[PDB]
Each structure stands twice: as C-alpha cells, then as structure tokens.
Amino acid sequence: SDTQEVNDITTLATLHYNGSTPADAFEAEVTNILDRLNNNGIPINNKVACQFIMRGLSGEYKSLRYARHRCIHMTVADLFSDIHSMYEEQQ
Amino acid sequence: DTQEVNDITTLATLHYNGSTPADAFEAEVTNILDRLNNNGIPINNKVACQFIMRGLSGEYKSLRYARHRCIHMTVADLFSDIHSMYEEQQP
C-alpha cells in the first residue's frame, strides 16, 4: 500500500512470460502496473514500457525481442497483439 | 536508448554494505534519480527512500527501520545516516 509504487516498479523491471499462463493475464498485470504508476505521477512512456515487456519474454516469445529497437515507434498494444497471436498459435 | 530501463533496473537492485565509499553510492543513486527525472519518470522522495533502504546489506541492514517514514524522510537525510555509519566504520 505504502510500498505500491516500489513493488509495481520492481515487477515491471522483473517481468517474465513464456506462454505457460494466459496472455490476457500477463497483459492485465502489465496494464495495471502502468496505470497505477501513471496515477502516482510516474509516467512510463510507450518506449520504456515496450522495453520492459520485451525483456520479460521467454520460450518461444523471445523471438518478439528482435523488434526491441523499434520500441520508440511500437505501441504497447501492438506488442500485446503479437504476444496474444503467439499464445493463440500455441494453443 | 535503454537508459531508463537500465536506471530503473539499477534502482530496483541496489546493494550497499559499506565496502565501497558512501560518496560513490550516493552519486550513483542521485544521478539515476536525476536522469529518470529528466526522462519524465519522476521518482519522489518516498519511493527513492524505499529503494535505497531495500539495497542496504551487512551492518547497513539495520537502517531499514525508518522505512515507514520514507514519506516524510528525505533522500538526503537517509544518505546522511549512511554516511554517518560509513564514517564510524572507517579507521
């Protein structure tokens, strides 16, 4: 509660996703961290968010990381689309 | 282009046990906070204080009991206490 921002930032910096849990749940976790950080006056822009998410991708999802260099132009929604697409074509 | 992610990761993984000068530790953290501020990721006194406390090891772990007042405690005040402990430990 008093440590929500520190916990949210720590989570963001230590994300991991390998497809073994629903992509929706991963998207929710990340989305809400970003929302809460925004509310607490710590705005994480699209580029930085994208980089944290990419860093977290393991297993087959590692492959999405070769777009990390375009994070500036890539939207978080676009990235989540690709993760969702990969999740679907693993199920 | 990954300066923010690197600066946040460092903040979230600080370690200090007195084995290096307190001035160097202060410098590292201060400049992370400065750069994050510049890049539109403003870490306030409370959150900064919490990250610093989390990183204290060895004899310095003991300082982690003012953590609850980080809201009212300043980063400068905490670095004072670390400096004070560092001085005591020196010849």
Residue numbers in the entry:
A (entry chain A): 261 to 351
B (entry chain B): 262 to 352
Tell me what the authors wrote about this structure, in their words.
Saccharomyces cerevisiae prevents uncontrolled retrotransposition of Ty1 subfamilies using distinct mechanisms: canonical Ty1 is inhibited by a self-encoded restriction factor, p22/p18, whereas Ty1’ is inhibited by an endogenized restriction factor, Drt2. The minimal inhibitory fragment of both restriction factors (p18m and Drt2m) is a conserved C-terminal capsid domain. These observations suggest a lattice-poisoning model of restriction by p18m in which the CTD binds full-length Gag and forms dead-end intermediates in VLP assembly.
Inclusion of serine substitutions reduced the aggregation tendency and improved solubility necessary for structural studies. The asymmetric unit of wildtype and Ty1’ CA-CTD (F323S) crystals both contain two monomers arranged through a single Dimer-1 interface and the Drt2m(SS) crystals contain four Drt2m(SS) monomers arranged as two dimer-pairs through Dimer-1 interfaces. Inspection of the structures reveals all helical domains with arrangements and packing resembling that of Dimer-1 observed in p18m and confirm that the F323S mutation does not alter interactions at the Dimer-1 interface. 3D comparison of the Ty1’ CA-CTD (F323S) and Drt2m(SS) dimers also reveals the strong similarity with RMSD of 0.5 Å over 160 Cα backbone atoms. Thus, this “arginine-flip” mechanism provides a further level of discrimination and specificity between AVL and VTF Dimer-1 interfaces.
